[PDB]
Amino acid sequence: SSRRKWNKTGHAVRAIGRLSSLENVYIKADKQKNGIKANFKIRHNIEDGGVQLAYHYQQNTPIGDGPVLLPDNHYLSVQSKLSKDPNEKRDHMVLLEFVTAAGITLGVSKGEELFTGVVPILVELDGDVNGHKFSVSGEGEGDATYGKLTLKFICTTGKLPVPWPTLVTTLVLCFSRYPDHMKQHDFFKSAMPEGYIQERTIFFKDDGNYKTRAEVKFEGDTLVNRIELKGIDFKEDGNILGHKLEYNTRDQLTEEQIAEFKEAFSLFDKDGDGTITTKELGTVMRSLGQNPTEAELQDMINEVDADGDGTIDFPEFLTMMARKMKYTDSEEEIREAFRVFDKDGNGYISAAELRHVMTNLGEKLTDEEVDEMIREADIDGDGQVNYEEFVQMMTAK
Ligand SMILES: [Ca+2]
Ligand SMILES: [Ca+2]
Ligand SMILES: [Ca+2]
Ligand SMILES: [Ca+2]
Ligand code: NA
Ligand code: NA
Ligand code: NA
Ligand code: NA
Ligand code: NA
């Protein structure tokens, strides 16, 4: 009962953490190359705690001379699920994926006609990472109508020398659902059938990088992604070549974890109308130190604003807290979070610093309950909460 008094205030923090970060795929026109540029960050969980980041840079250039749609700035959201086929002797990856355009608020080309139904997909990649060659064959299909891909990947050369997740980004964004108001912004479909070239450089923080080059085009009725990948400067024992990444990753919101999110949701949603406004989000951040402009609040809300109505619908909110427990935060992000409470920087959250936050955030919290709270997390016994004591209060299971 003092336990969830953490889970509430902790999720409220990890929510402002999420709204402050850039988890999507940010697309902008590249008129220079009559094509587009994209950039996003990828979170790879490490099987024994922590996260590997992969900072992605992306060029798309069309293959033919056909006029193409060059979009205003928007983004995609991807939701990847990796599983195994249990009949499958070979090194493989079953990939389900949902891909949705958003980030233009409220107020078709020949190409789209080609994606109206279900389309066969074939993927062929030849890889060299630190000189370990491998090859990968995929088949599956894309209902563009829903933003759904289903694909199976086999490593044709035996054992893959890199964790499968690192390849997911590399192994067909022409299957994104664009909403009706955004159809004039789908370059990918516009470029079909002749195709686009998809070039990426992918930096794994504290490790090597991939250079990828991909022909994505129709061959008959089948959409085909052919890829060369070249990895350099990886560490023999680092997270990639040491296969130290989680494959599976946890997709299970216990009944009870959704309810933790609603208790949080309701800290922002002060009027209980089931949506969070710039006004309400401002109110909570101000009572927690930060002091952002109208501009920042709109851009934070627009990071998670599916319907593009300029507010966080209770559902839009759950989606984002689901993400933020699915993928591990970085040490930078946890520190930023700590420093919301550790309002002096000494590396310890005092009884008197928890009060300052709790009672600035608007809760009764008499000097009895405040201490019941501290004691909850205080493993080493010191009457204060240190950074590693904090990371325990901010994890699942
Ligand atoms: Ca509200
Ligand atoms: Ca919304
Ligand atoms: Ca302190
Ligand atoms: Ca302590
Ligand atoms: Na340009
Ligand atoms: Na073209
Ligand atoms: Na190669
Ligand atoms: Na690039
Ligand atoms: Na290459």
Numbering used by the authors: 39 to 145, 159 to 222, 226 to 451
The publication says:
Here we constructed the prototype of a photo-switchable Ca2+ sensor based on GCaMP5G that can be switched with 405/488-nm light and describe its molecular mechanisms at the structural level, including the importance of the interaction of the core barrel structure of the fluorescent protein with the Ca2+ receptor moiety. We engineered a prototype rsGEI based on the conventional Ca2+ indicator GCaMP5G28 by coupling cis/trans photo-isomerization, which underlies the photo-switching, to Ca2+ binding. In the present work we introduce the concept of rsGEIs.
We elucidated the structures of Ca2+-bound rsGCaMP1.1 at equilibrium and the 488-nm switched-off state to 2.15 and 2.90 Å, respectively. The crystal was switchable following 488- and 405-nm illumination, suggesting preservation of native switching characteristics. The chromophore shows a cis/trans isomerization between the ON and OFF state. In both states it lacks hydrogen bond interactions, except from the imidazolidone ring to R57 and E126 (all numbering GCaMP5G; 96 and 222, GFP numbering). Remarkably, the chromophore in rsGCaMP1.1 does not exhibit the one-bond flip (OBF) isomerization observed in the related rsEGFP2 and most other RSFPs, but rather a tight hula-twist (HT). The HT involves a rotation about both the τ- and φ-bond and a partial transfer of the double-bond character (i- to p-position). The effect is most apparent with V54 of β-sheet 7 (V151 in rsEGFP2) that sterically blocks the position of the OBF-derived trans-chromophore of rsEGFP2 in rsGCaMP1.1.
